[PDB]
């Protein structure tokens, strides 16, 4: 019974915020309305929590009581004035820009993205008169020159891939706000523990609860996070007319669960990930690790200025190209070979002979796709589990 | 475990299509794969996975097992080549349109559609370059007229609301062939066990799995059946990049549960449903009557040509205008005030007094909604029940 | 909403007995109270509650508010005053026999019980000093007979395999009225619907909920009807201090639900049951049939005078004995092979080579069972399905 | 590693053991086998099943491939032979009591017991000819004193409270492998993570995984661990016959995916009661604080030796009473007034106005319950945040 009053903690924010059992018999957990619609005593009320001017339900597409909680807290967690839920991490970017973007409008972008946001963009909104420009976030002098009137939205994701490139937030926050665009930055990676852009001035924030959130790979969801303007804008349009990314409040209340243990498990994922990647910069089949942890990150002091701790997310450049990559991922034992992160169990990918195995190595490097790049999601096992697996397979990538 | 399709009865295939016991560990019901990602043994093997060399899944939001046997049910009960699960109504409408639809096409419309396609309609990709037209699908003298080297496809709902104002599946299924464009059915209220749009000529058909369905109302859910063509791109694009309306394994299996009863419900939705019709009609509070099972049906003939039987959606106007709705409904005991339609719960709504209160006789006239029009969404309860209620709530309509 | 009083009809009652939405932020369906604890909003209150003075809750192994919902209606359904839910039938029948049995009490049974009750008798509580007494309770010249000062309970089944004996509840009820003993029954097979033997004399009644209740086969649960003075102390004793066999709120949930086509599908049960009996019958390899429906049925008048219909269980004797039975069942395709009942599947079982292939026909038959005495428990799949299966089979068993 | 075969770390096993993915499509979470009963290709296969020929299932009250995992997942986590899952702690301890006891037999129990074991004992099987005798299992001598050759099982809870105190497991377990006897320890406080018996010479484990192991609140259920002999018993005595306490596969899901952060919460538990306590023991207020964290704690030392870490039950009490339990207790913001304990929400209680607010301060006393001892469940919101609510609701109890 906490989390809102003063200024309680990130942890008992996590637990409690938004929530007194006194308001719903006692219920120490929240009971999960997983109902479509609600009713009302008359028809009067149904008009007042129909045109906004009441406190109410009525269909769950629209607005849910556990789903309301979930995002009441994670707005806390987020530091903004509110949040929506959705069906995944799509729906929170895709309902976000249908409502914020139109025909003529510009959008900037970072210059690399997560494959479906990539595709959306250039082959779904993109082709419904948005206009598209990819600039380097980390480059103020090229966003300042990259602004026109025409320019609605600014969305990237910090870090991001494949080298944890960072952005400045706060720069980029304030050239917007001179120009009159709106910042969306994709927090997916960081969780509202790690790093908050709101703060440093984002104006919205988009999650795939699906990873690092939920934390243990067992639902679809995303989240967004803004003003009350925003969030409502994008809560009677964007999802409701234009997308149908409705969560269940099961899920909803899945992923509520696997908050309440937010910081203690990142604040795990880091510390593997520390040790692991000082272990990886070590060895000579190793010629090149992308990691916030270690001083040699280019955007060491940046990173350390948005960011709480480095993450959990390591990719380095195993020496020996493709082949050493496939034999790298063929030997992992405990490390799954599977696409996605944030999960309790580790997982580790190579796109040169996964996701873009297809390509070519003269067209997967067009596309920034190193040919021995490969990347780890490190979980919550025993980091000598994970070093040892690792070890092993270092010694068979060759 | 007897859905060999179009051969094994509806309600065989309705609890046994696509699955066999005996490949599951012996499990009667299938397990839930309530799982965001899926691991692959190497790297070639999703590479495979990947380049569609091999069969297997990799990630929820674009095919889960348990999601997989939901859709290929579905489909078989439509009579359709494949299906996709949707996180609502709005994820298979949205979705489907987004994907087919670009800018500059045109789409025919019904003139009445569910609140919310009219407004992503009009609201959402209408303000993205795609061109609408209403017309009357029972004419298809105009149909004929309105066609245009450019009209891409014909979206319409069947019945319709607010006077369950039927099409002729068929008769536009026929035109639309001869021009080249893509019929897309909203099957919502008859289900695949009254009418199958497929089978009249539709190319596809969009489900709001929310209502009769999951029977329940306990899950929001969309269903797309159509062929395989139609449907693989509609995964792959709409649900993939434009929507993420991804459904939820928990909610998948909840929806396969209720359809195991479908023909059930349905047989006492219609039966319950035209023995209030019988009552309404001969009631002097009622000045029109719509339900299809009624002789006196403008469109009786049509109707019982293309639906097994009558529904169990019934409307009526009350001579006293707002006044008598709003004294009616608020007087209802056994039926509940609120929106949706579907559950084993009667609904009942006022539009002049709820969802459209804030309007005025203005538009409730241009839109056809009578001060006194009334939709009941009859449950299961018993009959003598309901009709107590009705019949108490019309004297207090006075 | 129409609760009970017995005056809303069954139906009406299954689906809306004890439940408001107003009292619960107007949610159509009630949410699931998926929480271990229950807070105090003072000691004086939490005391209040552990004082029976205050009405509230504190734990979910004693009372649960969800579980609640399900026990309020199961009552209103049996029309007894009040309910139990437990996390199985065995945790019902345990749970009742284990808080009104002690030492030197002595059991009166029936001749044929369910396996595990059987088991559970002899192996278990029989075990403890209490004495076991088996009688046909269709004979009440027997049972007063072996009624002594000691007896303190009677339990049974109507109907009861192999062949759906039947029991003279009524009857028995005065004989155990007059003596001073508590009588009972496990409704299981009949469920509230086609049968309430607490209104013919019964004290208690147990059921299976895993099977018709739920109707779905997706959980194992467990219901106890009766007097608020028994069943409290079976829920405060029983349950809460020996078994311990607590029901999943989640498991409630899904059972209210299956429970609101309660009617519909014990309807078809028994359509498809009479039907598949009455094609048996006319089989020249079927020697003995055991269906309350049939007209030969040696207590087809007690049957019609204690249930509303004949049931959706069947027992019949293949000619072929031993091996007839085999054939026929390793040949069966749509029907299952498996233990079990009330599922919209349909299952069959042969005990001589199945759960009893371990005797000897020797043996089984000195136990009740033949060698060819087969029992399906008829599905709701399509009549023309279910037949062509067993007509297929019966040809295979030549 | 990927379970226990490169003999991984507790937090490796916790969330890998006994699964992998490349056997169940790939699926990175397992699913949830939500089935009731399980089909058989053939009744040879079924006969098999039955007898315990061929590895299957056919039925979940026996045993549920969902719950397999469970089970032995926890036999790895306590170093044990195999496990059992049952619905709810009490459900464990009975199902395992009822099976190894019968009339004539006596076990030996610790001085203070949980509650309702303790009702269970005294009341239950106790009511049922099986003698029982309460005897400090601290003292290694009384207890041996205690033997008899009618001793059959040794019950303890360690720590046990309202002081927790320990027990020596490896002690009494010595006395036991020498004068029969089998040994049960109720290891619900300090979870396998914290304390393993079965590795200091226990026979079996129960566990009210309704707490600490859960983790959430969410679920009510039970584990037993121990050899596969004596568990191999429970299962197919006391849960099957006896007990009925069934565990839904969703909540045994549910609570796999606790234990997958049990490491974690343990940890911050222990640190967070630590200092929790430290700072109870520098108040005016506090009187007495019973913590095995404390140097000052009486077992400290044997605690060490067992308890890998202190635990977070903390008790303590208040120099002013009844009164001065009460309003510190009315006072709390961030505690929770309620029974129950390893929530990640902080509870608290004070029985002499809670549960036995009811006795006089004689009955409290002849009974264990002091009149101003206060039980605090350490949650793992901010101990900052923590601090505060005790700090000013000891104020309050002036």
């Given at each position: 019974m906490h989390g809102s009053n003063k200024l309680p903690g990130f942890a008992t924010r996590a637990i409690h915020h938004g929530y007194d059992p006194q308001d719903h018999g006692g219920a120490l957990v929240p009971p999960v309305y997983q109902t479509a619609t609600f009713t009302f005593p008359t028809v009067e009320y149904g008009a007042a929590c129909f045109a906004g001017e009441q406190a109410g339900h009525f269909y769950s597409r629209i607005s849910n009581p556990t789903l309301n909680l979930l995002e009441a807290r994670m707005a806390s967690l987020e530091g903004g004035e509110a949040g929506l839920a959705?069906?995944?991490?799509?729906?929170?970017?895709?309902?976000?820009?249908?409502?914020?973007?139109?025909?003529?409008?510009?959008?900037?972008?970072?210059?690399?993205?997560?494959?479906?946001?990539?595709?959306?963009?250039?082959?779904?909104?993109?082709?419904?008169?948005?206009?598209?420009?990819?600039?380097?976030?980390?480059?103020?002098?090229?966003?300042?020159?990259?602004?026109?009137?025409?320019?609605?939205?600014?969305?990237?994701?910090?870090?991001?891939?494949?080298?944890?490139?960072?952005?400045?937030?706060?720069?980029?926050?304030?050239?917007?706000?001179?120009?009159?665009?709106?910042?969306?930055?994709?927090?997916?990676?960081?969780?509202?523990?790690?790093?908050?852009?709101?703060?440093?001035?984002?104006?919205?924030?988009?999650?795939?609860?699906?990873?690092?959130?939920?934390?243990?790979?067992?639902?679809?969801?995303?989240?967004?996070?803004?003003?009350?303007?925003?969030?409502?804008?994008?809560?009677?349009?964007?999802?409701?007319?234009?997308?149908?990314?409705?969560?269940?409040?099961?899920?909803?209340?899945?992923?509520?669960?696997?908050?309440?243990?937010?910081?203690?498990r990142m604040d795990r994922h880091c510390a593997n990930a520390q040790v692991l990647a000082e272990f990886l910069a070590r060895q000579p089949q190793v010629e090149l690790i992308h990691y916030p942890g270690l001083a040699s990150f280019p955007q060491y002091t940046l990173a350390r200025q948005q960011m709480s701790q480095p993450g959990g997310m390591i990719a380095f450049e195993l020496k020996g190209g493709i082949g050493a990559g496939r034999r790298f991922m063929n030997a992992l034992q405990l490390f799954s070979r599977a696409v996605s992160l944030g999960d309790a169990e580790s997982l580790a990918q190579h796109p040169a002979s996964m996701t873009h195995s297809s390509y070519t190595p003269e067209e997967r490097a067009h596309y920034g796709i190193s040919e021995g790049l490969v990347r780890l999601s490190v979980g919550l096992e025993d980091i000598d589990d994970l070093l040892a697996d690792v070890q092993q397979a270092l010694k068979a990538s060759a």
């Open positions: 959705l069906a995944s991490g799509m729906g929170a970017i895709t309902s976000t820009l249908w409502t914020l973007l139109r025909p003529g409008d510009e959008v900037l972008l970072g210059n690399t993205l997560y494959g479906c946001t990539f595709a959306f963009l250039h082959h779904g909104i993109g082709e419904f008169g948005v206009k598209l420009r990819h600039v380097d976030m980390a480059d103020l002098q090229a966003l300042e020159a990259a602004m026109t009137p025409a320019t609605r939205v600014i969305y990237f994701e910090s870090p991001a891939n494949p080298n944890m490139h960072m952005a400045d937030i706060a720069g980029v926050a304030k050239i917007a706000r001179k120009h009159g665009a709106t910042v969306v930055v994709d927090n997916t990676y960081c969780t509202p523990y790690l790093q908050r852009p709101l703060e440093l001035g984002a104006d919205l924030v988009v999650h795939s609860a699906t990873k690092y959130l939920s934390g243990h790979g067992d639902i679809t969801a995303g989240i967004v996070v803004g003003s009350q303007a925003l969030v409502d804008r994008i809560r009677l349009q964007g999802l409701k007319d234009m997308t149908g990314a409705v969560l269940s409040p099961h899920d909803a209340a899945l992923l509520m669960r696997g908050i309440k243990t937010l910081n203690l």
